[PDB]
Design a protein around this ligand. Sequence first.
Ligand SMILES: [K+]
Ligand SMILES: [K+]
Ligand SMILES: [K+]
Ligand SMILES: [K+]
Ligand SMILES: [K+]
Ligand SMILES: [K+]
Ligand SMILES: [K+]
Ligand SMILES: [K+]
Ligand SMILES: [K+]
Ligand SMILES: [K+]
Ligand SMILES: [Mg+2]
Ligand SMILES: [Mg+2]
Ligand SMILES: [Mg+2]
Ligand SMILES: [Mg+2]
Ligand SMILES: [Mg+2]
Ligand SMILES: [Mg+2]
Ligand SMILES: [Mg+2]
Ligand SMILES: [Mg+2]
Ligand SMILES: [Mg+2]
Ligand SMILES: [Mg+2]
Ligand SMILES: [Mg+2]
Ligand SMILES: [Mg+2]
Ligand SMILES: [Mg+2]
Ligand SMILES: [Mg+2]
Ligand SMILES: [Mg+2]
Ligand SMILES: [Mg+2]
Ligand SMILES: [Mg+2]
Ligand SMILES: [Mg+2]
Ligand SMILES: [Mg+2]
Ligand SMILES: [Mg+2]
Ligand SMILES: [Mg+2]
Ligand SMILES: [Mg+2]
Ligand SMILES: [Mg+2]
Ligand SMILES: [Mg+2]
Ligand SMILES: [Mg+2]
Ligand SMILES: [Mg+2]
Ligand SMILES: [Mg+2]
Ligand SMILES: [Mg+2]
Ligand SMILES: [Mg+2]
Ligand SMILES: [Mg+2]
Ligand SMILES: [Mg+2]
Ligand SMILES: [Mg+2]
Ligand SMILES: [Mg+2]
Ligand SMILES: [Mg+2]
Ligand SMILES: [Mg+2]
Ligand SMILES: [Mg+2]
Ligand SMILES: [Mg+2]
Ligand SMILES: [Mg+2]
Ligand SMILES: [Mg+2]
Ligand SMILES: [Mg+2]
Ligand SMILES: [Mg+2]
Ligand SMILES: [Mg+2]
Ligand SMILES: [Mg+2]
Ligand SMILES: [Mg+2]
Ligand SMILES: [Mg+2]
Lengths: 116, 205, 64, 146
Amino acid sequence: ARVKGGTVTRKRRKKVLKLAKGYYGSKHTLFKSAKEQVMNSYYYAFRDRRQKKRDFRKLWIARINAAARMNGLSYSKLMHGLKLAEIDINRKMLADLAVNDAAAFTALAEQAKDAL
Amino acid sequence: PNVALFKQDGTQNGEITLNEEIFGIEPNESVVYDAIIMQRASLRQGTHAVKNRSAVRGGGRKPWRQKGTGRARQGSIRSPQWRGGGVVFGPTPRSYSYKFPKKVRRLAMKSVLSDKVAENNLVAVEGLSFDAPKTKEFKQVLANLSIDTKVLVVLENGNDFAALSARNLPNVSVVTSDNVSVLDVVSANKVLATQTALTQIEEVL
Amino acid sequence: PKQKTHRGLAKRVKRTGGGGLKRGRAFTSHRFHGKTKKQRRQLRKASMVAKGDYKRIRQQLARM
Amino acid sequence: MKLHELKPAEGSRQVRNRVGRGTSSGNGKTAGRGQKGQKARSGGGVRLGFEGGQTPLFRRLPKRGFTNINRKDYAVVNLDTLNRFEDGTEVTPVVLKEAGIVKNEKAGIKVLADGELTKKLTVKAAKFSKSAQEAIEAAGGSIEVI
RNA sequence: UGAAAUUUUAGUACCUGUGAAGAUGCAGGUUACCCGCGACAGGACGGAAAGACCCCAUGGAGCUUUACUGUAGUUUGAUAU
RNA sequence: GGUGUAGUGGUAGGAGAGCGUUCUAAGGGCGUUGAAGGUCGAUCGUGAGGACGGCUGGAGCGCUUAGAAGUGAGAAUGCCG
RNA sequence: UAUCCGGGAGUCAGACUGCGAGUGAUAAGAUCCGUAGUCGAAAGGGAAACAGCCCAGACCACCAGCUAAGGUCCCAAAAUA
RNA sequence: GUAGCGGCGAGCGAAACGGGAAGAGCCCAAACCAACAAGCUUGUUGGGGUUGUAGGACUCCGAUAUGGUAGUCUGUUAGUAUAGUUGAAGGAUUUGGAAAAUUCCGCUAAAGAGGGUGAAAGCCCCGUAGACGAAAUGCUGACAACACCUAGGAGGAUCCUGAGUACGGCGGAACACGAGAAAUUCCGUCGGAAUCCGCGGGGACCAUCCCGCAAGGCUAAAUACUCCCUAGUGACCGAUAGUGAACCAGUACCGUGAGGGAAAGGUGAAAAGCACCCCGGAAGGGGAGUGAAAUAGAUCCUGAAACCGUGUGCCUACAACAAGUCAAAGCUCGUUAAUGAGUGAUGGCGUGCCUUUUGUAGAAUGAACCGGCGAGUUACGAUUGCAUGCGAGGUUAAGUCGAAGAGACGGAGCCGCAGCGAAAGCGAGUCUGAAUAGGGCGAAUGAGUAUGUAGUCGUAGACCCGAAACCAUGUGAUCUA
Ligand SMILES: [K+]
Ligand SMILES: [K+]
Ligand SMILES: [K+]
Ligand SMILES: [K+]
Ligand SMILES: [K+]
Ligand SMILES: [K+]
Ligand SMILES: [K+]
Ligand SMILES: [K+]
Ligand SMILES: [K+]
Ligand SMILES: [K+]
Ligand SMILES: [Mg+2]
Ligand SMILES: [Mg+2]
Ligand SMILES: [Mg+2]
Ligand SMILES: [Mg+2]
Ligand SMILES: [Mg+2]
Ligand SMILES: [Mg+2]
Ligand SMILES: [Mg+2]
Ligand SMILES: [Mg+2]
Ligand SMILES: [Mg+2]
Ligand SMILES: [Mg+2]
Ligand SMILES: [Mg+2]
Ligand SMILES: [Mg+2]
Ligand SMILES: [Mg+2]
Ligand SMILES: [Mg+2]
Ligand SMILES: [Mg+2]
Ligand SMILES: [Mg+2]
Ligand SMILES: [Mg+2]
Ligand SMILES: [Mg+2]
Ligand SMILES: [Mg+2]
Ligand SMILES: [Mg+2]
Ligand SMILES: [Mg+2]
Ligand SMILES: [Mg+2]
Ligand SMILES: [Mg+2]
Ligand SMILES: [Mg+2]
Ligand SMILES: [Mg+2]
Ligand SMILES: [Mg+2]
Ligand SMILES: [Mg+2]
Ligand SMILES: [Mg+2]
Ligand SMILES: [Mg+2]
Ligand SMILES: [Mg+2]
Ligand SMILES: [Mg+2]
Ligand SMILES: [Mg+2]
Ligand SMILES: [Mg+2]
Ligand SMILES: [Mg+2]
Ligand SMILES: [Mg+2]
Ligand SMILES: [Mg+2]
Ligand SMILES: [Mg+2]
Ligand SMILES: [Mg+2]
Ligand SMILES: [Mg+2]
Ligand SMILES: [Mg+2]
Ligand SMILES: [Mg+2]
Ligand SMILES: [Mg+2]
Ligand SMILES: [Mg+2]
Ligand SMILES: [Mg+2]
Ligand SMILES: [Mg+2]
């Protein structure tokens, strides 16, 4: 018996085209240019889902370094004093403190500068 | 295998004993399954065909040169990748049927009947001797025997009036004690049967 | 159509009880002055077909 | 069984391996034929015992023997069967065929002695082996020849 | 009034370098408001064409001959008419 | 079913589990109070994919088990439009 | 993890790096072997970019942490130690 | 797929036995006899007689019989094909344009096959089951008439029993059989037998034995096939499918011609197909109106995508970016209401997909895009695994009966149970060998078989496309020589 496949193909392609919204021109209308960009988008997504963490860590670190220089100390000597003083404070938290509560960050800096 | 014998009027006449050789066994479900698929594949007809690249009206002319054109290489107007085009393989005239061993067949029959007996879905009768083939009489018989589901009706070779009376009903299949089949019985949920028919079954088997 | 049996094999091997194949030997026809007698007596003794060769010819001499 | 509840036994029926229907099937995009080559072609490959022009095994070996058209191939009964039959009776090819022991009386029944006999029997056949004669006559039977 | 070849998508710079070894697209640096019109033709290893040179195929075709094997004709003989 | 240990990059390729399509047999159920198909949705599933709604539409189609295959397309200088 | 039996394959174009030799002009991203690795079939981090070099083997999620080679004046995280 | 054939290669490949389906056997020349004729034979007619446990003519004995027919527009008779007739049972509520749907109580069935009917109908219709029917022409089968065949027992004194024939040589073919040891059959050529104490065959050939009697002819049935007709069926197609053709298709069109060869289906239940009015030259629109519906109005059901537009929320004219991803301000909306949707300034990272490659972002190949179509299938066999049945017994094939079925019957045959050897032959042993030797192959160790299913192989186009080319018909000198 014969099989045509009218709906399978169309549904399978509408899925990709819905995934391909926001893409310039042909890349949201045509299945080939879209699919070729959906796969690359997923590659980039998988990769950025790792680089995200690197980026925020980098950012936090720059902030901590700035807030320490404003107290007369550097990121590295700060964090070494913390590891000495057994102070397990995440860098995310420490950046939030450097932004909002400069006094808490200053207290941590005093702890570290005593540890050293 | 003690089975309640009823009348054509519904009253219970008594009992009949049946061969444990046939009705008492454990059923073999794989065997029943095999027999089912075989009988359906046999009732299949297999008349279906298609025209390949050869049987299709046309071809011969290579529609253009091998070379020179900026056109793909093509060798016939009726190859598979043309708007007409012979089908690549497709169906053929084909026989799906197959025989398979007699012991498996007879074990299938025994297994089916024994399953019916275990589920109590036999109904024996002494009569079914209709003066004439009216179907409402047979329907009243079914009602007296409290049947409301599908049913297969086994009959001795000659009870024509009863066969005709049972024929037209949708719930009812009818068969004559030698043409009995696994597909018929298994399709049916219950089995009305004459004592004569049961004896014919137990002598042919 | 059923298989065709390779008659050149059917003339040159023989089934044993384990299904293996017996065979005559080579270097046993016409040029014996170049062969020592140990070779001649050891080559008039039949041998058996190899594993990888039976793998290649069984489909030909399936029943035979 | 019920037709709306059918099942086979496990492992009895297997799902076909369809070929060239995507990469994640594994049998896709080449059909398990691999990259280019004579084996990767429709109707490709080679003959069934072909070594690539190298001298084939059949050709490098000698023909041996002949066939005797007058050969007598006998149907064998190995003396462990006949413990069936009641002692004192008469064994024949007709008896053996009716029982179903010997279906092909090729050239005649030959009797051979591998198993132990334990009966008196008036056996008869085309040929006996000497060990079978000894065993039968020792049990107390009697050899004849048709 | 109204085509065609072509066309993976394109918001389609330059130098140096890299790299399937000669980059609009990668890197580093530099330059450059957005959109067009007329002209030119350096590049897009531009288009047209499954390189015609070359090599391969246990491919093909035509042709030659003291390659092989045959043959139509020519000739000689025997036999029949 | 759970606890622990160890592992789970992958081409050719081998093995096993599946999703989906058309049809059939049986069972059961849904449709002018609006089926399939079309379209939009911010939904569920590990994946193939599956539902539920809104609009369109106007008559056939699902669900469970099993079976049979013209059973899944993005490329063929592919064919037709 | 080795062996034996049997089913099914694919592979017979390999490349570079380091060490050992030949041919070479002890030239070649050359050629041919051995040996080990990597690629091929391997993403990721460094070498600017850079299959083949150094570190290291992606089952998934985390806006958590410790390290590797390589690095810490800015681009660009870390010492103007 | 045996025995054999075969560059003993590739491959080719029987027959008989056995089982079944169907069944039927008959004529003539010749010897001789009777008649006619020319010129005792020898042409014609009739009679006679057709064979191998040899037969017939011929010489003697009685039947006048007895059965059959593969014949006849001899007729009748019966049936059947080609028209046809009849053929049961339901009305109301809800939805709705319409009821066949829903609910209610019923009815019917030798009829619940199917189709149509404003939607899905056992009870509305056509019909179905069933029961009747042919003036006329055919056909089939019986029954009578006609017609044609149909005899028995001894002898073999003698005669006949298929002549340029069988056979042989040379050359070639067909036989499974390729000259090979090549029987058998047939064609050409040349030569060239006997005939009942005879002749041919039994795979060179001779002898023996057995079987048969050519050189003359006919013969139904089972078997193959379907342009067609009737009745039908489909785990066949459903408008790029299925016939090339569902549509006025071998058409339009191309070609001198042979020849090739398309595309193109669907309003609505019913045309009820838009009276009339307005714009306009008309077409085409806009109202009105039919209709359940007109975004169902001839491009007519549904009406995707590419593509072309209109408007609108956000962004965009110091920016380079395989065009995305991740983070993110601002703005605007509000969901299958849940760590919401859309947009996106700006920043970080990032050289498409396929193929083929040692290696391709590749300046190596393919793709303009969208949609459809489009590639490991089947038959017969072999083998392995899994499953089932049975088990050292497992199983039927063809064919018959029977729904185009299952099933029963059918044991012929197939595999396995005993192998070893070239073979004779022996036999749990056998072969080699002088050999109780040793060794090889085998057994004591043991399990196979039927079916299904999947992987794989073979033969068939065998996975899909793609050559130049080869061969065999035919068509072309309206161009040009
Ligand atoms: K394979
Ligand atoms: K230019
Ligand atoms: K040539
Ligand atoms: K498709
Ligand atoms: K590796
Ligand atoms: K109806
Ligand atoms: K011959
Ligand atoms: K960006
Ligand atoms: K099998
Ligand atoms: K088994
Ligand atoms: Mg990528
Ligand atoms: Mg053709
Ligand atoms: Mg077609
Ligand atoms: Mg020799
Ligand atoms: Mg299958
Ligand atoms: Mg693979
Ligand atoms: Mg692909
Ligand atoms: Mg290769
Ligand atoms: Mg390929
Ligand atoms: Mg290969
Ligand atoms: Mg050679
Ligand atoms: Mg270059
Ligand atoms: Mg460069
Ligand atoms: Mg980069
Ligand atoms: Mg202009
Ligand atoms: Mg070019
Ligand atoms: Mg080329
Ligand atoms: Mg893995
Ligand atoms: Mg891993
Ligand atoms: Mg459908
Ligand atoms: Mg397909
Ligand atoms: Mg396409
Ligand atoms: Mg090193
Ligand atoms: Mg190199
Ligand atoms: Mg090296
Ligand atoms: Mg490779
Ligand atoms: Mg890497
Ligand atoms: Mg790569
Ligand atoms: Mg650290
Ligand atoms: Mg820094
Ligand atoms: Mg045959
Ligand atoms: Mg009626
Ligand atoms: Mg209808
Ligand atoms: Mg009703
Ligand atoms: Mg002869
Ligand atoms: Mg001759
Ligand atoms: Mg068509
Ligand atoms: Mg359509
Ligand atoms: Mg500027
Ligand atoms: Mg600006
Ligand atoms: Mg870029
Ligand atoms: Mg490209
Ligand atoms: Mg191109
Ligand atoms: Mg030629
Ligand atoms: Mg002319």
